[PDB]
Amino acid sequence: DDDLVDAEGNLVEDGGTYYLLPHIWAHGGGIETAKTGNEPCPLTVVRSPNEVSKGEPIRISSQFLSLFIPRGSLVALGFANPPSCAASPWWTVVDSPQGPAVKLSQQKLPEKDILVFKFEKVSHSNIHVYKLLYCQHDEEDVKCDQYIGIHRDRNGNRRLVVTEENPLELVLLKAKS
Numbered sequence: 001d002d003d004l005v006d007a008e009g010n011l012v013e014d015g016g017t018y019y020l021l022p023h024i025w026a027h028g029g030g031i032e033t034a035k036t037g038n039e040p041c042p043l044t045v046v047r048s049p050n051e052v053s054k055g056e057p058i059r060i061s062s063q064f065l066s067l068f069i070p071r072g073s074l075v076a077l078g079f080a081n082p083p084s085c086a087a088s089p090w091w092t093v094v095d096s097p098q099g100p101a102v103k104l105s106q107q108k109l110p111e112k113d114i115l116v117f118k119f120e121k122v123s124h125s126n127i128h129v130y131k132l133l134y135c136q137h138d139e140e141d142v143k144c145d146q147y148i149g150i151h152r153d154r155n156g157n158r159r160l161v162v163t164e165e166n167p168l169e170l171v172l173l174k175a176k177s
Contacts, residue, residue, distance in 0.1 A: 002071040004060075004119055005128040007171040011068045017057040017080045017175035022047070022168065023122075023129040030055015033083055033104065034157045041085035045102040047150060047158040047168075056081060057175035059089065063115050071121075074135060074142070076114040079104070080175070090114040093134055093162065100134065102148065102160040112137075118144045122169055131167045 004012040012018065019030045029048035032055050036044045048055050057080040062073045069075065078089035086104040092113050093100045119130040135144035149163025160168075 001068075002121075004069045004071070004130070004172070007127060007173045009128075010174070012060060012172055013174075014062050014064075014066055014069050015059065017059050018172040019054040019056075019175060020058050020077075020170050021054065021173055023125070023127070023171055024169075025051060027051075028158060029053030031058060031160075032056050033079075034159075036153060036155075036157060036159070040106075042083045043086065043104045043106070044157065045091055045104065045160045047160065049156070049158060054173070060172070069119075072118065074115045075117050075119065076111075077117055078114075092116070098151070098161070100136075100146070100162040112142075116142070117148075120144075120147075127171055129169050129171055131169055134162050 006012050021030050029050045032048050033042035034044045034046045035042045059078045059080055061076045062069045077091045082089035087107045091102050092109055094103050116135050118133045120133055122129045132148040133144040134146045134148055135142045146162045147167035148160055149167050150158050151161050152158055
């Protein structure tokens with residue numbers, strides 16, 4: 001059990017809320033939403049361009065019933081305060097011509113459609129920093145073999161989508177209480 005650790009050195013609490021901040025200060029702020037393409041409301045998960053913004057508090061929930069979160073545990077990530085038009089706070093990944101993208105949903109989704117993320121510790125770093133993996137179905141199981149990154153749309157939105165090249169690296173900062 002090599003548990004997830006937060007930006008202040010404490011074990012990440014399962015079901016707890018955290019800001020998802022970039023490792024490098026210059027690279028923008030925390031996670032929030034945008035309304036893109038033909039969506040009727042903000043259903044796109046993006047990174048804030050404000051380096052001072054902590055973004056939205058995000059709930060991290062494991063596939064296990066543990067107080068903390070083991071390493072290779074699958075997780076679901078959800079907004080503590082989701083846009084009024086999403087049916088639930090949880091993120092999901094949607095296929096597209098450009099490739100899979102991270103979005104919210106106007107309907108309740110099955111657990112196997114939200115429990116599709118995993119954090120991967122980064123080497124060479126003093127603070128606890130992780131990459132974010134996407135785990136596609138394996139006709140029966142699931143395989144975490146693609147990473148999540150940023151694709152800036154023609155409007156400047158910093159969209160979270162599956163990436164091939166430069167994955168994002170995050171620190172998890174515990175949310176207010």
